[PDB]
Amino acid sequence: LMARNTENSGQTIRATLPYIRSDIPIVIVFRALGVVPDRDILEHICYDPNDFQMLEMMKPCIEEAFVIQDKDIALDYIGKRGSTTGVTREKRLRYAHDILQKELLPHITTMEGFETRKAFFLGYMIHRMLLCALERREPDDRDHFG
Amino acid sequence: GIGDTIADADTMKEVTRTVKEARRQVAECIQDAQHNRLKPEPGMTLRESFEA
Amino acid sequence: KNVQTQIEHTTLSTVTSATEIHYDPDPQDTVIEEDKDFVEAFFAIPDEEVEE
C-alpha cells in the first residue's frame, strides 16, 4: 500500500503474486484476466456511490497502469523468476498464464476457463484495505486461534 | 483454618451492600456517558477517560 | 495559559478539514456551496489596486 515520502507520491498500492518476483501494481493484474477497460475494474473493488474517498486512492494505483496497457505488455512485465532464462516474449506469456492457473489465488479453481472468478476476489481483498486507511474499521486480530 | 477466612455474618451483609451500592455508581456512568455528559480530559481520550 | 499556548507546534492544525480545489476563471468567480462570496465581493469593491 505504502503511504510515506510526502514527496513521492500520492499513496499508491501494489501486489506481489508469489513466488516471483517484485512488486506489481494492481491494475496490471485485472488487465491480465479479462478486464482491461477502466471503470469496470473499480466496480470489482468499490461500488459507487461512492464514496470517491475510498476510490480516489485509486488515482495513484491506476497511474501505475498508464502504460500497461492491454494484454500483451501486461503478461510481458512478468519476466523475472528466476535463475536466468527466457528469450523472450512468447515464452514469457506462457509463464504468465501458468501462474494465473496455480499461483494467482491457487484455491477457487485450478482449471483453465475460470479467470473471471479471481477477478472479484482481488477487488474484495483491496476492498478491505481501503476500509482501514480511511479508518472505517479495524485491522483483523491475529489472536485467534478462533 | 477457614474460620479465619469467614467474615462475620452480620458484618458481611454490609459488605455486599457497599458493593452492589457501587453498581448504581456505574449505572450513573454507563448510561450518563451515552448522553455526552462526561466529560473527558486530560491525557485523553473520551472513551479512555470513561474507562478511567 | 499565556505560555501553555505559547510553545506549541500549532501550524496548520486548525484546518484539518480542510483543503479544497476549485477552478475559477475570472478573478470574480465563485459559487457555493454555502454563503461567503459576499465577503469576497466586498474585498474586490475596495479596488485599491486590483489591477496592480
Place this chain on the structure above:
Amino acid sequence: ETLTQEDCWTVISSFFEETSLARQQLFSFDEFVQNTMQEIVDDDSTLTINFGQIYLSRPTMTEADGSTTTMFPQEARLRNLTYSSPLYVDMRKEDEEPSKVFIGKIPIMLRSTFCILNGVSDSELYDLNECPYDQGGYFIINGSE
C-alpha cells in the same frame, strides 16, 4: 418441566461413554486410511507406469529363518520392533491384470479403525498383556512410544 443441574452431568456422561478421551487422535488417523490418501497417489500417477488403488493390509512381520506372523503388541515393543504394515499398490505396465507390488511400510497407530485391537472386549485385552485404560494415541516405532 424446569431442568436441574444434576441432570446435565447425566448428559455429558453419555459423551464420554462413546466419544471417550483422546477420541480424536486416534481419529485424525483413523481417516488416512483408507482414505484421502488413495486419491493423492493419483494426482501424480504418471510416467513415460500408473498407480492404482491400494490394498489395505494388517500389521505383520517377516524375518529370516522365521516366517510371516502378524504383530501382537505390546508383546512386541520390547523386541524394539517398529509397528507398521506393508503398502501394496496395484501398478500398471500391458497384461490386463495389475501387479500388487509392495511399496515400503507405514507405521500404524494403536487402537484405530485398522488396528489389531479396535473392537476387543476388556476381558480379552488382558490376555494380550494390554491395559483396558490405554486410550491409544501413540506409535511404537523402534520399540518406544
Place this chain on the structure above:
Amino acid sequence: QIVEGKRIPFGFKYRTLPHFPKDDDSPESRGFIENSYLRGLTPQEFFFHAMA
C-alpha cells in the same frame, strides 16, 4: 482483574464473551468478581481471573 492496563479486553466481536450482549461496558461481565475464594467465584468470572 486487569490486563495491559485495561479491564478485560473485548474481542471476539464487540463483547467480552458469548454470555453477554454487546457493548456491555459493565463490571457484571468485564473482569470483575463480587465474591471471594470462599463462595466463591462464578464461571463467567473464573476464566476472567485465570487469564489475568
Place this chain on the structure above:
Amino acid sequence: GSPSAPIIEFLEEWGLETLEDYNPSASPNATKVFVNGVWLGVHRDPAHLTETLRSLRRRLDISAEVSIVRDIREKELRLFTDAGRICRPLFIVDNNPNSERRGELCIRKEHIQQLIEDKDRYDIDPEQRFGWTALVSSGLIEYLDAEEEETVMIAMSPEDLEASRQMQAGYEVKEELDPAQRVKPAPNPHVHA
C-alpha cells in the same frame, strides 16, 4: 474435515444463489457467500438460506463439523468445513416462536430419562443406545466452531434462562432468600431471548 463437494450441492441448488457475473450496479447488495474462503456465489435473502442450513446439521444430513457465519456488519456469510476447526458441544433453544409460548429449553426431562435407559445397557442392537451419538441427529446439541461464536449468544446456567423468561412478563426476583453463594449478575441486561 468433510468433503467440500456435496456442500455446494445444497447451495448452488438452493436457492436460488447465482454464480458467474452479476455485479454491475445491482447485486451487490445483495450480500455475498464464501465457502472455505471460495466466494462462488452472490445470494439474496440470507434469511431463508441460513435457518435451513442449520437444520441440516440438526438432522445430520450434512457433516456436523460445519460452521456458519452471518456478518451483518460486513455482509458476507462465511462457511468453513476444512479440518482443524475446534468445536464445543452446546445446548440450543430454537425460538420461532411457535411451540411452548416463546421458549425455551430444547430438551425435556423425557429426553434425559431416555438416556439413562442406555446406561443400563448394552442389551439391544443398531438401533443403538442413542447416547450422544444421536443427540445431535435430533437437533438438541449443536457443536460450535470458534468463529461461529461471534454470531451466537450462549447462556451460563438454566437458572439464568428461567429468570429471563419470567421477566418477559414481569416476575419477582427473590434475592432476599439466597444464602452464601456465587453472587450472579442479576437480573439480565436486555437480551430478550
Place this chain on the structure above:
Amino acid sequence: NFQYCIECNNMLYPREDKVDRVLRLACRNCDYSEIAATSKVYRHELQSSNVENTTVSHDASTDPTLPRSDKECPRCHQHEAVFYQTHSRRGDTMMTLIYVCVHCGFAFEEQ
C-alpha cells in the same frame, strides 16, 4: 463529479476552457469531452466521521447477539428495538448510539 464517459469507459481528466472560461472534463484514452458539474474539484479532509447513516443495520433484527430497548419506536409503531454504537480504532467518536425496530428499520437517533 469526476466520472468516466461513454464510448470507452475510462478515467476523466480535468481541463479548463480558457477562451470560453468554464469547466470541462475529458479522458486521456479517447477524445470525449463533457461539461463540468460543479466548481469543486478535489478535497482533502483530515477525517471527521465516515458513516453518517452507515446503511443500514438492515441486519440488526436478526442479530441474536445484540441488545434491545422497550417501546418508543419513533414513527412506524410497535415495541422492542435493537441498538448499538460505533467505536472505530481512534476517536473520540463519542457514541451516537442508534437503534432499529424489529418490525421496521427506522434509524431513530436520539440526543
